[PDB]
Structures are given as C-alpha cells and as structure tokens.
Amino acid sequence: SALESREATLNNARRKLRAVSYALHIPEYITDAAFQWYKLALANNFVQGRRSQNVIASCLYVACRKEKTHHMLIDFSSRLQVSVYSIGATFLKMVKKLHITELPLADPSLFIQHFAEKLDLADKKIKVVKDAVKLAQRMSKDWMFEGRRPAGIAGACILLACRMNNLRRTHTEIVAVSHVAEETLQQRLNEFKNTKAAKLSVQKFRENDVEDGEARPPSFVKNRKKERKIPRNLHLLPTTDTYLSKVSDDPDNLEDVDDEELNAHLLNEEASKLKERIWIGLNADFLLE
Amino acid sequence: LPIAEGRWLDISMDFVTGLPPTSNNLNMILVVVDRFSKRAHFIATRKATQLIDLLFRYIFSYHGFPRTITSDRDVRMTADKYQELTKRLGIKSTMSSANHPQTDGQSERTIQTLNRLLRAYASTNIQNWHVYLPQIEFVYNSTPTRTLGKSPFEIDLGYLPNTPAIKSDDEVNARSFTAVELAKHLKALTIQTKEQLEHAQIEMETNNNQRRKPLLLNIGDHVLVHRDAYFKKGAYMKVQQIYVGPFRVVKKINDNAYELDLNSHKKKHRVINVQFLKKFVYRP
DNA sequence: GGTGTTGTATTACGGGCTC
DNA sequence: GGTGTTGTATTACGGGCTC
DNA sequence: TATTTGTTG
DNA sequence: TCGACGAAATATAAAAATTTAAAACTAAGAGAAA
DNA sequence: GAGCCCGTAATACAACAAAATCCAACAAATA
DNA sequence: GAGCCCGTAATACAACAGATTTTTTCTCTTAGTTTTAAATTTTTATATTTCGTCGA
C-alpha cells in the first residue's frame, strides 16, 4: 500500500539516526525532533542522490540547534574521513528547501560550559567558565565577533580566561577538540589585547566593561575605505537596455571587430603540423575513449 | 489467569476463521467477552484489514478501554501496527503462544456456546446469520452461567431489561430507580463475583491438577519442542521422523512457559507453552 | 453374524527390619 | 509481564418418615 | 464409453 | 617565536553541459499462524 | 444400620480448540 | 500403628482413529525501477579557515 512503503523508509531513517545518536550523545527529544524533521523532509520530496549520512546529519544538526546546545559539525563529521564542509553545504541547501523559521541564535556562552570539562578544567568548575562567558558577553557587544566560527571565538575566550587567571596548561593542546587554526586564534587573541587597555591583566580584568562605539571589526578596517592608505532619484537610475542596443547584432556587421583580431583569431596553419606532432605524442589516447 | 479487577478491564479476543458465507459483506464472527463479567458481543468481520481497530474500537469503546487483552498470536493482533497502538494507549497483551488456544479461554468457551446458539438460530436459516447474531449475544447475556451463578447483566450493572418475572428473594429489583447509591451495589456485586471467580479458579485447579505434573526449570536447560509450534501449523504431520534438535532456554517468561533460542531465521515467535517442551536430559 | 486395544511411566502391595 | 474454561447430564448430600 | 457424482479409510 | 603575507576552500546566481550514484518506491518470495 | 422421597446442589467430562479441499476408488444416471 | 527398602506387579491414560492445501492478512529479505540531485569548469567582488612559507 501507499502507507506501507512509508514505514520501511521511516524505520531505516530511525535506525541510522539512532546509530549516529549513539555516538553523538544527544537526548531523546532532540532525536524525536530530528525524526519529525526527517518526516517533513520526506514530505517535501526528499533530496534523492544525496548520501544518507548527509541528510540525517542535517536533521540532527537542526534538531540540536533548535534548542540551545553545544554540538558542532566536526562531531557530526568525526569518522576518519567525512569532509565536513560537504555536510555544511547540504545543510545550507536544506535551509531553503525545508524553509526553517524561528531561527536559533548564535551565542557562544553555552559552548564554554561544554568545552570546559575537556580542556582547561577546574577544581570547582565555576571560575574559568564564568570568567570566559563574562568576558565573551562584553566582547560580543563590541561588534567584533560577527560570522567568525563560534568554536574559534569560544576557544579564544577560554584561552583569554586562562591567561588572566592561573592555570598551568599547554597552549597548543586545545586544538584536539576546538579544531581552530593557530593563525586566526592568535589573531583573535591579539585583537582582544589591542581592544583592551590591559589595566589589571595580572590580577583580574575590569569589572565595569562598557565600550559604547569606539571600536570597529577588522573586516571594516580592511574594506571600508576600499583602498589602502597605510533615497536617490529614480531618474538617476538608467536602464541597461540601451547598452545592449548599442552593439549592433546585424548579420552584415562582421567587420566591426578589426583591431588586429582579424589577423589573429586562430592559430596559423603553418604550425598546425608542429602542434600535431606533440598532439599525437601526448593528446592521442585522450580522444579514443 | 489472574481473576479480575473492576468491571471491563480484562478482555478476551479470538475468532473462528471461516463460516458458510452470507451475501458478500460478512464472513466470520469475532467475539469480545470480558474476563470478569463474560459479556457477549457480536463483532461480525470479513475474515480483517488494519480497520480491525475501527470495528474493535466501536464495539469495546461502547463501554471503554481495557487494561490487558488475552488473545492468541494472530496476525490481526500480533499486528505491529496494532500492538504499538496498545502500548501508546496503555493496553497490555498476553498473546497466547503458537497453537496454544487455551489461554484465550472465555472467548473460546463463548464461541463454544455461540456455536450451539448459532446452530440453534440458523439451522434452517444459513447465509443470513448476521441478523440473528445480536439475538445470539443477547441470549448469551440474559442466561446465567455456572461459575458465577448470575446473568452477565447481573455481573455488570444488573438491569436485565426483559424482566419476564422477578427472580428469587423478591425485592425492588429496579436498578433504574437507584441513582446515586449504585456504588455500594456495584461494590457488593464485585465482592461476591470476585469470591465466585476465586471459587471457580480453585475448583478448576482441583478437578484438573489430579494428574498434571509440574515442570519448573526457569534457567539453564536444553529443552526441546516436539514438532508442534516449532514447525508450521500448516505443515503436515505424518510418519516423518520427529528429530527436533536440542534447543536452549534463556529466560523464564512465565510459570507455564519458557522462551527458547530458536535456531532458525526468526521463527516469528519464541514463546512455547509447557505442553510442547519435554525437557531434554544429557548424560556424560 | 459386525463392532476397541495395548505401550508406558507411574504407583500400589508383599518379604525383611526397626520397632 | 503471557498462558485454560464453562455447559451438561449425572450423581452426591441434607430435611422428613418409617424405623 | 467417457464424464459425472453419491459415500468412505 | 611573534609578526607579515600568499593562497585554495566555501556562498552567489546564473545560464549551461556528460556521467554517478542513490535512496524512495514497487514487486516477488519465503515464512507466520488462527 | 437400612432404605425411601425430594430438593437442592455439587461434579467430573468433554467441547472451543482454523476451515475446507479433495486422494483413490467402489458403484448409479444419463445420453 | 509407623515408617523404610526393594522387588514385583498391577494400573488408569492416552494414541490408532484419511491427510493435505487453502483462506486472510501481515512481516523480513532481496532484486528491479524512477526522480532527482550531484561529480569537474568561468567568475565576480566580497570574508574567514587553514595551510604554507618567510623573516629577524
């Protein structure tokens, strides 16, 4: 029956989703929301030809994102070769297809509470995570973190909290789970060093952090001036149809492009055999197929 | 089985597969009788689809939802679509094992009584017994039984509507007049019918267990199944050798059965009532 | 004229001891 | 969790008589 | 004379 | 060993233009089991 | 003990145990 | 009574009662179809990531 064929597909989807969730460690209601999103995807003429892990990964990610959590796409793509950015591209394609509404926010405060236990742990687990989220809350309102890989800003905030506090830990060991390049990491660290006066860095940062304006994102510095220094009127908006009409498409207009192009459109025939020598030398079996 | 609870909480389910067909709209009779009151019902099916829950819902939900269903492993009730409905709704399922229809019981005994009643009402009137089926169930309902001694109307709210004559120990006998005091009456009926069910249980146990030898293993044995509920019920029994291999038991699912690790694809069930085991014993 | 009938675990009854 | 169960002729046991 | 159709291990 | 830059990978919106899965969807085929 | 009437009232005993096709083969019935 | 051992020996209890195909849904398994979306190119300005290299 028509209803009979749905059940086997849903059972396969449930089996694969539970198989991934057994390694992702996600709660039950997240998996339930992911399965209902998979049902919605099948109701939207589910994308055929895609790999099975891509669509289930997209549904799992959107379910884990609809409630504020900590899971990252690398964790979805952590089986020895997965090419995470293809999963991200499939998710981006399914954003428009599934028509996601009530989009969730992107705030890295919940990231720190999960990154704390693996790298740079604390005896009470109250000091370093609260310090990192407290500095991140005011560094967010300075319009510096905008579309800049929330895992990276979370790791940078954790490193800043470790720097201002006392914690004997290896600097380079954080890349095991953060997976952030050192170049952008040190860029964000010395960006924080530049934007802060470092008045009481050795003891504890300033307890009244207010930066109203006064700062710009680095990309604004790069390309606002569009160079290097080291409500208009409708009449002011011309139509481009006249630009297309300027060039004549007449059949007899075959000699309007005489700017020495007529002598050099193609290769000369005297060197055709010279080309053909190395052509049959190399580009010979490339055509027989 | 454990005797009962409050009225209409345990329900027995089975049906006879085939009858001489009527005009081509009805084929076979399904029965619902509760374990407590043994109230007859007229579920006339077509030998069915996944719409079993429709007709079944329309005929038990007239009273209300039960707690457990005592039935067989039939495909209309093994029925993964229908079982999940019971798990969601809050209905258990005893699901008597392969070719062991004894557990269904009250419905089997009712269709025993129904078969005689259906023969009585359709001896000269075959092919239109669906008209007489409500008369069959109403007659079964109005006639007192033996193990309870009262009519199944009286085991329920006692409102035998026919009242040809007043019964013994003449009283008001008009439960319509009673409006709020029905709680004490139903409590009294429940108490006496519960002790009558216990009396029926102990009487059955006395007159049956005079030779029934028990078998209590519950773990770690190598029991057999002598070619019944192991092979198909539709598989023919003949003078072919009975050489079922030595199986194993891993769980004590009940006092009177043990689940087995059936060395097949799945066998679709692994519950074997003790009437097929005949425990294997090795020797060094 | 012609109409049940044995195999099988299971269990009941005497010699010999304690009385 | 989940695992027999009543309809039916047939027959056995108390009040009341003979003792 | 072949194709039926009652009943019975 | 912190700073300084180069550079592919994505989106992007189209027109396109040959091969590659690829997973829903049918449809036998066995196996249950009253 | 000994039996009898009569009136209830227990009491093992078996039926529900899916349903209905023929298989092989006697002999009746036409046409 | 009261039980026990053991050695024979009766003792009710059940199987032989034509056997097989169907009938109606269901539920894994396993091979064939269908719609559809995707592997390598131009390309264009934008930005961030991650290598990759170089320098004093």
Output the DSSP codes for B124-177.
S-TT-TTTTHHHHHHHHHHS--SSS-S-HHHHSS---S--SS--SS-----TTT
Answer yes or no: are the C-beta atoms of A77 and A84 closer than 8 Å.
yes
Answer yes or no: are the C-beta atoms of A12 and A35 closer than 8 Å.
no
Answer yes or no: are the C-beta atoms of B19 and B125 closer than 8 Å.
no
Answer yes or no: are the C-beta atoms of B28 and B46 closer than 8 Å.
yes
Residue whose tokens read 């009805």: B26
B111 CB closer than 7 A to any strand G atom: yes
A172 CB closer than 7 A to any strand H atom: no
Answer yes or no: are the C-beta atoms of B39 and B18 closer than 8 Å.
no
Residue whose tokens read 């006066």: A197
B153's tokens: 């109307």
Q: Which nucleotide is nearest to B96 (CA to C1')?
A: D3
Answer yes or no: are the C-beta atoms of B178 and B184 closer than 8 Å.
no
Cβ count within 10 A of residue B207: 8
Give me the half-sphere count of Cα atoms (radius 13 Å) on the Cβ side of residue B137: 19
Partnered with residue B32 across adjacent β-strands are: B13
Answer yes or no: are the C-beta atoms of B69 and B13 closer than 8 Å.
yes
Residue nearest to nucleotide C10 (CA to C1'): B211
B259-276 in b/e form (b: 16+ CB < 10 A) is bbebeeeebeebbbbbeb
Please give the Cα distance from B154 to A20 (Å, whole number).
58
Please give the Cα distance from A33 to B72 (Å, whole number).
36
With a CB cutoff of 8 Å and minimum separation 6, the contacts of A99 are none
- Within window 242-271 on A, which residues have Cβ closer than 7 Å to strand H? none
With a CB cutoff of 8 Å and minimum separation 6, the contacts of A222 are none
Answer yes or no: are the C-beta atoms of B197 and B148 closer than 8 Å.
yes
Query: According to the entry, how was the structure determined?
Result: cryo-EM
Q: Phi/psi of residue A232, each to 5°?
A: -75, 165
In the chain, the amino acid numbered A201 is S
Strand D bases near protein CB (under 7 Å) are 1-8
Strands of B271-273's sheet, edge to edge?
B249-254, B257-260, B271-273
Cβ count within 10 A of residue B114: 22
The spacing between the Cα labelled CA in A241 and the C1' in H44, in angstroms, equals 21
Q: Does B169 carry a binding-site annotation?
A: no
B50 CB closer than 7 A to any strand H atom: yes
Overall residue count recorded for chain B in this entry: 284
Cα separation values, B276 from A148, B54, B224, B231, Å:
70, 36, 8, 12
Pseudo-torsion of CA B155, B158, B164, B168, nearest 10°? 70
The spacing between the Cα labelled CA in B280 and the C1' in H46, in angstroms, equals 81
Q: Return the closest-CA partner of residue A110 out of A157, A162, A167, A69.
A: A69
Q: Return the closest-CA partner of residue B252 out of B211, B208, B220.
A: B220
Strand F bases near protein CB (under 7 Å) are 2-6, 9-12, 20-26, 31-34
Cβ count within 10 A of residue B281: 8
CA angle B94, B100, B68 (to 5 degrees): 15
Q: Which nucleotide is nearest to B77 (CA to C1')?
A: H26
- What is the 3 state secondary structure string of B193-219? HHHHHHHHHHHHHHHHCCCCCCCCCCC
Cβ count within 10 A of residue B16: 15
Partnered with residue B11 across adjacent β-strands are: B34, B69
Q: Return the closest-CA partner of residue B218 out of B261, B260, B253.
A: B253
Residue A21, helix vs strand vs coil: helix
Q: Which nucleotide is nearest to B269 (CA to C1')?
A: F32
| Strand residues in chain B grouped as ranges (E) | 10-15, 28-34, 43-45, 68-71, 92-93, 249-254, 257-260, 271-273
The spacing between the Cα labelled CA in B110 and the C1' in H11, in angstroms, equals 37
Strand F footprint, Cβ within 7 Å = A 2, 5-6, 8-9, 12-13, 42, 46, 48-52, 55, 85, 89, 92, 183, 186, 190; B 14-15, 17, 72-75, 78, 97-99, 101, 229, 231-234, 264-265, 267-269
**Burial of B96: CB neighbours in 10 Å, binned 0-12, 13-18, 19+:** buried
Q: Return the closest-CA partner of residue A19 out of A60, A64, A47, A66.
A: A60
Please give the Cα distance from A11 to A172 (Å, whole number).
44
A176's tokens: 């095991």
Beta-strand pair B249-254/B257-260: antiparallel
**Burial of A58: CB neighbours in 10 Å, binned 0-12, 13-18, 19+:** buried
A228's tokens: 């290097």
Residue nearest to nucleotide H20 (CA to C1'): B236
Strand H bases near protein CB (under 7 Å) are 13-14, 19-29, 34-39, 46-52
**Burial of A279: CB neighbours in 10 Å, binned 0-12, 13-18, 19+:** middle
A229's tokens: 């220094």
A88's tokens: 């991200």
Residue whose tokens read 């589910």: A46
Q: Which helix (H) or strand (E) holds A93?
A: helix A84-98
The spacing between the Cα labelled CA in B276 and the C1' in C14, in angstroms, equals 39
Q: Which nucleotide is nearest to B21 (CA to C1')?
A: G19
Answer yes or no: are the C-beta atoms of A109 and A133 closer than 8 Å.
yes
Q: Does B80 carry a binding-site annotation?
A: no
The spacing between the Cα labelled CA in B101 and the C1' in H10, in angstroms, equals 37
**Burial of A160: CB neighbours in 10 Å, binned 0-12, 13-18, 19+:** buried
Please give the Cα distance from A181 to A177 (Å, whole number).
12
A94-120 in b/e form (b: 16+ CB < 10 A) is beeebeeeeeeeeebbebbeebbeebb
Q: Return the closest-CA partner of residue A57 out of A106, A29, A19.
A: A19
Residue nearest to nucleotide H49 (CA to C1'): A181
The spacing between the Cα labelled CA in B48 and the C1' in F33, in angstroms, equals 14
Please give the Cα distance from B282 to B284 (Å, whole number).
7
B144 CB closer than 7 A to any strand G atom: no
**Burial of B211: CB neighbours in 10 Å, binned 0-12, 13-18, 19+:** exposed
Q: Which nucleotide is nearest to B256 (CA to C1')?
A: D3
In the chain, the amino acid numbered A206 is R
Answer yes or no: are the C-beta atoms of B143 and B114 closer than 8 Å.
no
With a CB cutoff of 8 Å and minimum separation 6, the contacts of B129 are B19, B22, B118, B121, B122
A99's tokens: 């028509």
Strand D footprint, Cβ within 7 Å = B 1-2, 35, 38, 68, 70, 92-97, 100-106, 108-109, 112-113, 116, 143, 145-147, 200-201, 203-204, 208, 251, 253-257, 259, 271, 273
Please give the Cα distance from A154 to A128 (Å, whole number).
12
**Burial of B223: CB neighbours in 10 Å, binned 0-12, 13-18, 19+:** buried
The spacing between the Cα labelled CA in A175 and the C1' in H51, in angstroms, equals 15
Please give the Cα distance from B91 to B76 (Å, whole number).
16
